From a paper:
Three proteins, Dvl, [name], and Axin, play an important role in β-catenin-mediated transcription through formation of a transient molecular complex which is translocated to the plasma membrane in the canonical Wnt pathway. Furthermore, Dvl, [name], and Axin can directly interact with each other through their [name] domains which form the same head-to-tail structures. The mCcd1 and zCcd1 [name] domains have a ubiquitin-like fold with five β-strands and one short α-helix. [name] domains of mCcd1 and zCcd1 are arranged into head-to-tail helical filaments by parallel β-bridge interactions.
Interestingly, the mCcd1 [name] domain forms a unique double-helical filament with seven molecules per turn along the crystallographic 21-axis with a pitch of ~145 Å, in spite of weak ability for homopolymerization. Two left-hand helical filaments engaged in homomeric head-to-tail interactions are arranged parallel to each other. The crystallized [name] domains contained seven (mCcd1) and one (zCcd1) molecules per asymmetric unit. The mCcd1 [name] domains in the asymmetric unit had essentially the same structure with an average root-mean-square (RMS) deviation of 0.55 Å for 391–468 residues. A double-helical polymer of the mCcd1 [name] domain is assembled via zipper-like interactions between two head-to-tail helical dimers by the insertion of loop β1-β2 into Site 2 of head-to-tail interface in crystals. The mCcd1 [name] domain forms contacts with four adjacent [name] domains of another head-to-tail helical polymer through two types of interactions. The first and fourth contact sites present type I interaction between the hydrogen bond of Arg400 (loop β1-β2) and the carbonyl group of Phe442 (loop β3-β4). The second and third sites present type II interaction between sheet β1-β5-β3-β4 and loop β1-β2, where a salt bridge is formed by Asp399 (loop β1-β2) and Lys446 (strand β4). Comparison of mCcd1 and zCcd1 [name] domains revealed rotational differences of 39.0° caused by type II interactions in double-helical polymers, which involved the insertion of loop β1-β2 into Site 2 interface of head-to-tail contacts. Furthermore, structural and mutational analyses revealed that mCcd1 [name] domain auto-inhibits the propensity to form homopolymers by the insertion of loop β1-β2 into head-to-tail interface. Interestingly, two mutations, L402A and W466A, in mCcd1 [name] increased the molecular diameter of the homopolymer compared with that of the wild type.
Author numbering:
A (entry chain A), B (entry chain E), G (entry chain G): 389 to 470
C (entry chain B), F (entry chain D): 390 to 470
D (entry chain F): 387 to 470
E (entry chain C): 387 to 469
Write the structure that this text describes.
């Protein structure tokens, strides 16, 4: 529980990918994520998140310094080429 | 041109493959495609297609007599074990 | 008893197969690295069956991390970088 | 590089070691026939080349016609030769 | 033609042209020891063989145990002998 | 209707050449052995053009086996096992 | 140093040959090599080389002027009749 399980989808494959990031769920920022998958160019990023009021939601994050929202102690993401 | 540029992904590499088929975009069928890269093993086939309504879509093709949908004069495909 | 390993490289197009003495649960990345004997700064991916998510290509980095199996065998991709 | 010739690195199912040759023509000039002629292939084969596709990025492109020009990757030609 | 012997083709770093020998045993019968004994290895090498895998297809399988049966490809044995 | 034989030996850096009255397809290992008339234990290799893999140094040991030719001739290497 | 150890294989013997060339590793050219083993001589020449890009590789050289790549202080070569 010192690390975070990351599952992400790419339009480059129909089978998802899974990596583990050193930092803990609350600690992980977009930059950490970007660095984690060694993305080729620049893209759009979405994350399965549990919004308190409106419920489950696919949240997009931009600034590398923003923390990634988790879903059940893990991070679920979609990577769109953009 | 008297040829269509084909880019396809396989589970056997994260780097895509590229071949050129003598037929033109509208002319190319699934059989042409199969013959082009896949005479032996049976797979599921998906193609990046521009749907005039809902935007980009990954269309699966079925009929051997059916035509392969193009995306920007090219064919982009995913080949899966199934 | 031992583990059947099938891996792909940017150097063959045709996969490689080796057998590691340790059993599926026992095999760590270091065991794998040592097994393939290539001098490299590589990335490693493995076909894995995650309880919650199902089929997935998992990347591993610690040498002391145990390699996930798929059907009592290990299926891997070795990238350059 | 560069300009008189082209560095060619190819893999064969016949060797676990890659091979390296240098072709007189420059990167843009080299055709498949030039390549074929270069490595004394004894039989029909399939040929793949590491190429940088503007849009879709890195890719292993197969070439068929002896006249078509071989795509380069960082000034070198990187190829795979299959017994097919 | 003949089927109680096995055609063996192997590559070495010692020649850019492959070698060919015939082993008295049949494809299923041939073990690594049989192979070693055959091409008269001088000591220690790594051995790879072109093999047809069930789900995985054509694959270069490495074998270690003398008593292991060498996998065939198209009724012959195709091998690489590394240092 | 005979066969030109060129062979190399570890006791001469100059190859040897003999002619065997049999024709290419007819010549066996025994014919070859007899031809060189050297009583001893040896390994024999022959330049051959295999229909499948092409140019190759094939080893033979069944005396009753036909020697593979290379362009209407026989090219051989003689060692000591 | 003062001279380079050369080991070469021929279709003339299943046994390799060894000669020593006066020049040093970096200095030795193909012409030097040809001259060294009484290049009849116009054949194909290959050399075990340590390429920093792709590691161990059998490099072919064919102009008399080009300098022979070494492998661990020595030269390892294959001479084919071509």
């Amino acid at each position: 529980s010192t690390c975070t399980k990351v599952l992400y989808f790419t339009d480059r494959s129909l089978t998802p990918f899974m990596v583990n990031i050193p930092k803990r769920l609350g600690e992980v920022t977009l930059k950490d994520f970007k660095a984690a998958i060694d993305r080729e160019g620049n893209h759009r990023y979405h994350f399965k998140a549990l919004d308190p009021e409106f419920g489950t939601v696919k949240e997009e994050v931009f600034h590398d310094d923003d923390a990634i929202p988790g879903w059940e102690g893990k991070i679920v993401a979609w990577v769109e080429e953009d």
